[PDB]
């Protein structure tokens, strides 16, 4: 009833606070090179006429340093996952109790800075797994084909939106974070207009 799976990764997490899609994931450079070893080897052999020995040597050589050729291949792999946004994967948070501790995301970007060894996560999907940034190592599992990508759609982030406690209600997991709310109320509830009685004169 359990296993140590192949094609997996494990790292700490950070946030995607810039404008983004809620179901996209950014993985660090080092994780991308080792996880996508055979995807890159396929591209290197075809495009650059490398042998298998040369391709394996090329990939392992550039795990700890940035390489422009590898970076171009990463985008080509992501762009070739159409019509999906990226490469399907599942992110697990422990302990696993509720739907939300296991979510399906799409890898859409490999970070170009090698000093960042964290998986950037959307800020809109942090409440459901009760995930925080204080030493939380999450488990990533790459989906090998399209058949499993469709199967793991059942745990997409939108599947925990509707509350399971009270009918016709949206779960509290969808509520915005503190810093964003403070900005909005600083704008909406400002006394920037005269009272309505004075407005009518």
């Amino acid at each position: 009833f359990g296993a140590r799976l192949n094609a997996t990764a494990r790292a700490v997490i950070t946030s995607i606070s810039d404008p983004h899609d809620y179901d996209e994931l950014h993985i660090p450079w080092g994780v991308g090179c080792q996880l996508l070893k055979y995807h890159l080897t396929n591209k290197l052999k075809a495009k650059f006429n490398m042998t298998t020995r040369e391709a394996f040597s090329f990939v392992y050589e550039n795990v700890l340093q940035y390489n422009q050729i590898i970076a171009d291949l990463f985008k080509e792999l992501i762009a070739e996952a159409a019509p999906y946004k990226g490469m399907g994967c599942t992110f697990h948070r422990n302990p696993t109790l509720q739907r939300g501790s296991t979510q399906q995301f799409f890898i859409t970007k490999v970070k170009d800075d090698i000093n960042d060894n964290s998986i950037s996560m959307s800020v809109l999907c942090l409440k459901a797994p009760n995930a925080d940034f204080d030493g939380d190592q999450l488990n990533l599992t790459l989906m090998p084909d399209v058949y499993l990508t469709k199967a793991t759609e059942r745990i997409a982030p939108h599947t925990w939106v509707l509350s399971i406690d009270e009918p016709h209600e949206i779960s509290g997991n969808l509520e915005l974070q503190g810093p964003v709310v403070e900005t909005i109320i600083n704008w909406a509830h400002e006394k920037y207009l005269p009272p309505l009685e004075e407005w009518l004169k």
């Binding site: 509707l162 509520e175 509830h189 006394k191």
Partner: protein
């Protein structure tokens, strides 16, 4: 004066056009015939919460969708000239998104897939985050000692720190009462970062009172209280040995043996989930059963009955909306899980389950949902009368070691469990019925441990006997896997229910 806009017209604007509306008071005209007087910023926020309605052009927009829905323009000017509108909170924004999706669901005649609406809701929240964080980059909130001085220097706050009886009554009720009165006045602390967050739910009064008023009585590690209180707040500081030391015991109390708590909660969650999984499918529709269930309705369980279909007078079905106070103290005939006649030997229909089944994603194990809902609330309370005793009490009742096996019918046992569960946590009746139903067997005499159909023709059984005699696949996943292998009954051809773990025992073969 007082430019007039149409609700649907505003929703059709592009984002650049919406943010370009003038700073003014205006009238928003809705499809229900009413009009709302408000300002542009509240209107702009409300339109962003109407995103699901963008995909359905013919759905009317009633006036309650607007945030300031209480300021309705009427003939008498004394009804809107000095009316205070709603307060923007993270919960309020979610509620207006909730209103939009269920307005679409009702208008469509309950024909739109709820999974489609759930996708629209999160997408709408995503669009709200993208637009607000970019357009409102000039309206960041800040904190400094300047904000602290504003609240600290208020005359009434400074009077709730002097001439106080050093007792529980003098501090927690009189002194704390005065500060709460000041913080709740809408005319005080206008534009203050700390107070504005408190009104919108960002802050909480419990922490603020211990900061601006007297700290109070901390307890020792054995939950024993001290005779003398802490006569100062956090902002001023605690600089004497006695009060500082007793305050430290709170930090000691914060760190406890959560490792044991994690071990116990994990074991409890695993145990309940394994047995609950025997109730698998939830089919939409109505089974047309004449079997109803008579349940008392009380003030404690009225909220737990939301979504349950009950037969009112003249023989028609209506569902509890949660505010039927006139039903308290009476007995109604409910459509119940125990009365279902669905052909599926491990499934029930939507009507018997209740309206809460609309929210469940398609194809989900309904038994696991009930166990997760109960486990989530208990685990949250236990980790954050002890709730550990509460968890042990629920476990002993359901698993029969005042045990569930004592009762002769499920109908008589549900109110007892519902009252027990809803006294500490909040558990829906639909979840309560599923958990009780999982512990039912057809015939103990003939050792038929399958679920009974309908559920009123069955009996109760202990947890240990059920986990070892229903299906060997489920048995191989709990404890003492050697014992079922020795049981002579395991080798006799019987009709048995199946468990989700059956496939993994065979490695995937069928």
């Amino acid at each position: 004066n007082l430019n007039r806009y149409k609700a649907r017209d505003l929703l059709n604007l592009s984002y650049d056009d919406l943010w370009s509306l003038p700073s003014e008071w205006h009238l928003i005209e809705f499809d229900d015939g009413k009009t709302v007087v408000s300002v542009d910023r509240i209107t702009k926020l409300s339109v962003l919460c109407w995103y699901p309605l963008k995909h359905y052009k013919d759905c009317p927009i009633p006036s309650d969708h607007h945030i300031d829905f209480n300021r309705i323009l009427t003939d008498n000017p004394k009804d809107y000239l000095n009316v205070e509108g709603g307060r923007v909170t993270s919960k309020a924004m979610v509620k207006h998104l909730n209103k939009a999706i269920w307005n679409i669901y009702d208008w469509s005649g309950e024909t739109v897939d709820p999974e489609v609406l759930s996708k629209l809701a999160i997408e709408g929240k995503n669009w709200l985050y993208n637009q607000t964080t970019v357009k409102l980059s000039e309206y960041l909130a800040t904190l400094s000692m300047f904000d602290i001085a504003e609240v600290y220097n208020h005359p009434k706050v400074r009077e709730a720190n002097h001439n106080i009886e050093p007792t529980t009554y003098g501090i927690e009720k009189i002194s704390y009462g005065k500060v709460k009165e000041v913080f709740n006045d809408p005319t005080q602390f206008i534009g203050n970062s700390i107070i504005e967050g408190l009104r919108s739910g960002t802050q909480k009064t419990e922490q603020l009172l211990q900061a601006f008023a007297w700290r109070g009585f901390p307890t020792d590690i054995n939950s024993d209280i001290f005779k003398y209180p802490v006569t100062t707040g956090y902002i001023d500081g605690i600089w004497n040995l006695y009060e500082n030391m007793i305050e430290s015991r709170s930090g000691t109390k914060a760190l406890l043996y959560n490792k044991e708590l994690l071990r116990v909660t994990e074991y409890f969650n695993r145990k309940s989930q394994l047995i609950a999984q025997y109730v698998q499918r939830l089919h939409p529709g109505d089974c047309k059963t004449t079997i109803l269930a008579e349940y008392p309705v009380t003030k404690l369980t009225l909220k737990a009955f939301k979504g349950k279909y009950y037969q009112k007078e003249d023989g028609k079905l209506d569902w509890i909306r949660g505010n039927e106070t006139h039903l308290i103290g009476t007995k109604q005939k409910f459509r119940s899980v125990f009365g279902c006649n669905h052909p599926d030997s491990q499934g029930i229909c939507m009507t018997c389950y209740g309206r809460l089944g609309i929210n469940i994603p398609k194809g989900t194990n309904i038994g696991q949902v009930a166990a997760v809902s109960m486990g989530d609330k208990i685990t949250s309370a236990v980790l954050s009368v002890n709730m550990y005793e509460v968890m042990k009490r629920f476990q002993s009742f359901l698993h029969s070691g005042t045990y569930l096996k004592n009762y002769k019918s499920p109908i008589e046992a549900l109110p007892v469990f519902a009252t027990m569960a809803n006294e500490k946590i909040s558990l829906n009746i639909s979840h309560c019925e599923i958990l009780i139903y999982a512990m039912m067997i057809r015939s103990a005499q003939y050792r038929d441990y399958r679920l009974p159909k309908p559920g009123i023709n069955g009996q109760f059984e202990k947890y240990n006997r059920l986990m070892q005699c229903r299906s060997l696949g489920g048995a191989m996943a709990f404890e003492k896997q050697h014992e079922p292998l020795n049981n002579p009954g395991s080798f006799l051809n019987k009709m048995r229910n199946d468990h989700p773990y059956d496939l993994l025992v065979k490695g995937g073969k069928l």
